[PDB]
UniProtKB/Swiss-Prot annotation, chain B:
It is found in: Cell membrane; Cytoplasm; Lysosome. The chain holds residues 694 to 756 of 790 of the full protein. Homotetramer. May convert from a homotetramer to a homopentamer to allow pore dilation. Interacts with TRPV1; may form a heteromeric channel with TRPV1. Interacts with SNX11; this interaction promotes TRPV3 trafficking from the cell membrane to lysosome for degradation. Belongs to the transient receptor (TC 1.A.4) family. TrpV subfamily. TRPV3 sub-subfamily. It comes from the Eukaryota. Residues 1-63 are cytoplasmic. Abundantly expressed in CNS. Widely expressed at low levels. Detected in dorsal root ganglion (at protein level). Expressed in the keratinocyte layers of the outer root sheath and, to lesser extent, to the matrix of the hair follicles (at protein level). Non-selective calcium permeant cation channel. It is activated by innocuous (warm) temperatures and shows an increased response at noxious temperatures greater than 39 degrees Celsius. Activation exhibits an outward rectification. The channel pore can dilate to provide permeability to larger cations. May associate with TRPV1 and may modulate its activity. Is a negative regulator of hair growth and cycling: TRPV3-coupled signaling suppresses keratinocyte proliferation in hair follicles and induces apoptosis and premature hair follicle regression (catagen). The gene is TRPV3. This is Transient receptor potential cation channel subfamily V member 3. It is linked to Olmsted syndrome 1: An autosomal dominant, rare congenital disorder characterized by bilateral mutilating palmoplantar keratoderma and periorificial keratotic plaques with severe itching at all lesions. Diffuse alopecia, constriction of digits, and onychodystrophy have also been reported. Infections and squamous cell carcinomas can arise on the keratotic areas. The digital constriction may progress to autoamputation of fingers and toes.
Amino acid sequence: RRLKKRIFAAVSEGCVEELVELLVELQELCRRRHDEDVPDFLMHKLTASDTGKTCLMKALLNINPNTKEIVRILLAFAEENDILGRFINAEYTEEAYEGQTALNIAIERRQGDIAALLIAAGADVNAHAKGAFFNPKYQHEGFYFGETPLALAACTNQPEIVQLLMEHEQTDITSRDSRGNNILHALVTVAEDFKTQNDFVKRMYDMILLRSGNWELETTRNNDGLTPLQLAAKMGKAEILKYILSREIKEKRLRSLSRKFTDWAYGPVSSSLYDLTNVDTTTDNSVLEITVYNTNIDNRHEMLTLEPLHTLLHMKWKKFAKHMFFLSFCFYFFYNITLTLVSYYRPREEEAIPHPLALTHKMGWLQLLGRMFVLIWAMCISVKEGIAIFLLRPSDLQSILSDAWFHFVFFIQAVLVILSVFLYLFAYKEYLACLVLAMALGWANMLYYTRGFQSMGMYSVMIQKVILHDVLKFLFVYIVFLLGFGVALASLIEKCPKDNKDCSSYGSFSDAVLELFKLTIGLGDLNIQQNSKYPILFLFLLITYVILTFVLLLNMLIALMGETVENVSKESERIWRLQRARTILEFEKMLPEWLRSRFRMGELCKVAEDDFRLCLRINEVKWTEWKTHVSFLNEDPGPV
Amino acid sequence: LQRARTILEFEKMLPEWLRSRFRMGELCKVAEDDFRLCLRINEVKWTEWKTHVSFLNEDPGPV
Ligand SMILES: CCCCCCCC/C=C/CCCCCCCC(=O)O[C@@H](COC(=O)CCCCCCCCCCCCCCC)COP(=O)([O-])OCC[N+](C)(C)C
Ligand SMILES: CCCCCCCC/C=C/CCCCCCCC(=O)O[C@@H](COC(=O)CCCCCCCCCCCCCCC)COP(=O)([O-])OCC[N+](C)(C)C
Ligand SMILES: CCCCCCCC/C=C/CCCCCCCC(=O)O[C@@H](COC(=O)CCCCCCCCCCCCCCC)COP(=O)([O-])OCC[N+](C)(C)C
Ligand SMILES: CCCCCCCC/C=C\CCCCCCCC(=O)O[C@@H](COC(=O)CCCCCCCCCCCCCCC)COP(=O)([O-])OCC[N+](C)(C)C
Ligand SMILES: CCCCCCCC/C=C\CCCCCCCC(=O)O[C@@H](COC(=O)CCCCCCCCCCCCCCC)COP(=O)([O-])OCC[N+](C)(C)C
Ligand SMILES: CCCCCCCC/C=C\CCCCCCCC(=O)O[C@@H](COC(=O)CCCCCCCCCCCCCCC)COP(=O)([O-])OCC[N+](C)(C)C
Ligand SMILES: CCCCCCCC/C=C\CCCCCCCC(=O)O[C@@H](COC(=O)CCCCCCCCCCCCCCC)COP(=O)([O-])OCC[N+](C)(C)C
Ligand SMILES: CCCCCCCC/C=C\CCCCCCCC(=O)O[C@@H](COC(=O)CCCCCCCCCCCCCCC)COP(=O)([O-])OCC[N+](C)(C)C
Ligand code: NA
Ligand code: NA
Ligand code: NA
Ligand code: NA
């Protein structure tokens, strides 16, 4: 084009001597041009007209030893022509970079010196790169950081640029974006575990919060209605949680920005106070509630190890959840005994016209009481579990097994009763089959109530794992052999002579499959003479079945469990507290308002001037790094 | 490894026309007059930051 493409090259390969000669020619064209269409024209020449890109952008996307000199010349040239208000603050247009600017490029490309120049020249420090690349939908579609220059410098570990932007006086640190996320929401979004990144996101989290000096940021809710604290519990960032939930700011004049407070300390003994503002379930969407009910993450059982939550679970147990767990046991325990006895001691003779659970002929005070309590408590589970199964809305398959299995069996156990209670006086005679399943299901379910005890609870966690990792693999392969060798052995058995009808026990498929099952469990006798056409061939398939099943698969099953027990034993305690935590909160959601208030946690403490907060007292003993206790709330240690 | 053997044995059976459409990689210009077939893989690395000087396209992202 004889003006355009010659400049975009000169800024790229580091061509100073050429670039100067190009911009002089760019003036000579304009000395003939009027003094009104200068600014609108110079932009179209230093602009690509399809992407919105300019030459200051192209200069910084291609870094070189002469970048910093190209920036001096171009920004200088913008000054004489009076275009240093839209040239430095130019943005893309296409679809996926809408809002990205030269400052946005300088910060990522790690030119803090050039970034300082652009801000001094009047670069907008509050741009919003809102393009699709800057708001992906699949990580491995792009990169999200919060759309702001301050968030990029923080999310990319550039502390010197992060400090420079905050000191600038127009930097709106409290700015929100398309997702509603401010600077702190975005750091929670990009955080990762320590082996992946480093602890720098935690350090940027501290630096920006202290420099601000208020609770405005952590109080801000995003478009989904979430604070940075709630957002961390949802997305699963334990390292950032452990920082917030136990934050100490020793610097008086910033101590009110804390959540951990040293009430008193005398030597190695200390007493800390943990704020419970939006952690306890007094509010709608608390940290505790997210931690227990978030089925989208796979590290919940690490979260309830954090001290304010862990102590908070233990106290809810000591006060009301332990006692309710004992009552729920007793009502469900006598519930199954009643199902047992109305059934086992039914009127078998007379063809059982006065069905069990009838509420019929006269009375007797055990005959009447029992049959009422069942049909009521049957409906009570069905409604409760009917609601409960509907709320969580099973999305994936790992959740119902890991969070909801016992909820279904009680739904099934309750409906089988009610299915029976219909079929008694209304329809066919299969009511009995539904009632016998209800109790055998009912009695085996009692492993649920083991979880009040740690020892039996951890034991129950391992039963769950060993079934899903070992048994279902085992049962599948065993059946392909059991039915395969079964029909093969049954296919050989001749018709019995009419003299002896019972010439063989493999006379059919169902007969052979049963007898092979008997061998595996060690029950019965084994006669090789079975009226077969090919006896040595008949023995061959049988002994073959023994070697695969008796020698290999059964004993192999024991060996694979030992591998399961070894790996799972290091995690069964924390998974137990997760299931236990779910039990405590479900009890807690049932209690009325007046009974909820008296069992409210924490005591009201004065952590600062006119800042009365509810906190949790936890005592500690520390011997290692002694210090002079300067920060505290009460100089007289001890209670009261 | 066993799975890889299964994939290739299937692959040796397919006809020519059906082999071509399921051909892998996209044709990219890695250098001057050097058009090669390559495989795109995305990565995320946080540890050793640097100024990205060597690349093929200054406009990131697909297309
Ligand atoms: C002041 C006295 C109380 C006043 C009245 C308050 C009434 C409150 C009303 C509560 C709900 C009542 C209706 C039942 C709910 C339906 C569910 C069901 O059938 O089983 C329930 C029976 O387990 C229970 O714990 C409920 C029995 C009443 C609780 C005891 C009173 C409150 C605590 C008193 C303080 C004690 C400490 C005192 C220390 C000073 C729940 O069992 P589950 O196991 O959760 O659910 C089974 C299914 N699952 C296993 C799949 C989850
Ligand atoms: C789950 C994951 C494992 C997947 C592996 C799948 C296996 C893959 C390989 C399979 C090998 C092939 C075998 C089947 C084909 C031949 C059958 C045939 O010829 O006709 C039979 C059809 O079958 C019946 O009638 C079944 C009768 C019950 C016996 C088998 C139950 C075993 C189930 C297992 C236990 C758990 C089941 C749990 C699920 C329900 C005819 O039956 P019969 O005996 O002639 O009846 C009439 C004669 N009589 C009067 C003497 C009775
Ligand atoms: C026990 C074996 C040794 C154990 C160790 C295990 C290792 C060895 C495993 C060996 C596998 C099988 C062993 C079967 C045992 C003999 C059964 C038999 O003889 O049945 C009958 C023959 O019917 C047959 O089917 C004979 C065997 C056919 C060939 C088997 C090998 C596959 C070769 C296929 C070619 C492809 C391969 C080509 C190369 C790539 C006769 O037996 P019977 O009726 O009881 O006899 C009584 C006489 N009566 C009939 C008058 C009543
Ligand atoms: C530990 C593990 C096992 C637990 C299982 C429970 C223990 C064993 C259970 C029973 C003993 C069996 C012997 C026969 C006596 C039955 C009496 C009876 O009530 O029968 C009626 C059912 O009654 C009901 O369904 C009412 C429901 C409430 C009371 C249930 C009784 C046991 C409760 C506390 C149990 C302690 C539990 C622990 C408490 C913390 C109907 O039957 P019947 O025809 O009137 O019966 C006499 C028939 N006979 C003359 C032919 C004999
Ligand atoms: C109405 C029919 C009733 C029949 C039985 C009556 C008699 C009573 C018999 C059995 C009930 C007693 C056994 C369970 C004991 C407590 C739990 C336990 O120990 O661990 C596990 C038991 O493992 C399973 O649930 C695996 C799935 C098959 C189980 C087969 C029995 C029950 C379902 C029958 C099939 C019906 C299907 C029909 C279609 C709906 C817990 O279950 P999970 O969630 O799988 O494990 C989580 C694993 N995790 C730790 C990795 C997260
Ligand atoms: C039919 C099938 C029944 C279902 C299964 C029943 C399970 C098998 C029965 C018993 C197993 C005993 C194993 C030893 C326990 C030691 C470990 C432990 O956690 O101790 C706790 C026990 O103290 C409590 O108060 C918690 C349990 C109370 C609620 C349970 C009620 C329902 C089960 C009633 C069942 C009884 C009737 C059983 C017979 C019908 C200590 O208290 P904590 O407050 O947890 O503090 C933890 C402190 N620690 C960790 C430092 C220790
Ligand atoms: C078929 C005919 C008989 C009936 C059979 C029924 C049998 C069941 C009977 C009764 C119910 C008990 C069920 C088992 C409970 C779990 C055990 C337990 O906690 O062990 C713990 C050992 O440490 C102990 O303290 C266990 C000893 C307490 C029980 C003492 C015997 C009384 C119960 C009667 C039994 C004796 C009399 C025998 C006859 C009944 C190991 O648990 P853990 O998880 O490693 O943690 C523990 C603490 N820790 C963290 C410090 C290490
Ligand atoms: C005799 C009468 C009954 C028939 C018996 C035949 C039984 C077989 C029936 C049917 C075929 C199934 C065969 C087993 C499949 C492999 C297991 C598996 O993947 O285990 C995995 C966990 O467990 C699961 O992933 C399975 C849980 C989901 C399925 C739920 C049950 C439905 C199937 C019906 C069964 C329930 C009802 C019970 C009755 C059928 C463990 O594998 P891993 O290597 O650790 O990796 C996993 C992922 N990971 C990397 C994230 C860890
Ligand atoms: Na045996
Ligand atoms: Na035996
Ligand atoms: Na035996
Ligand atoms: Na071992």
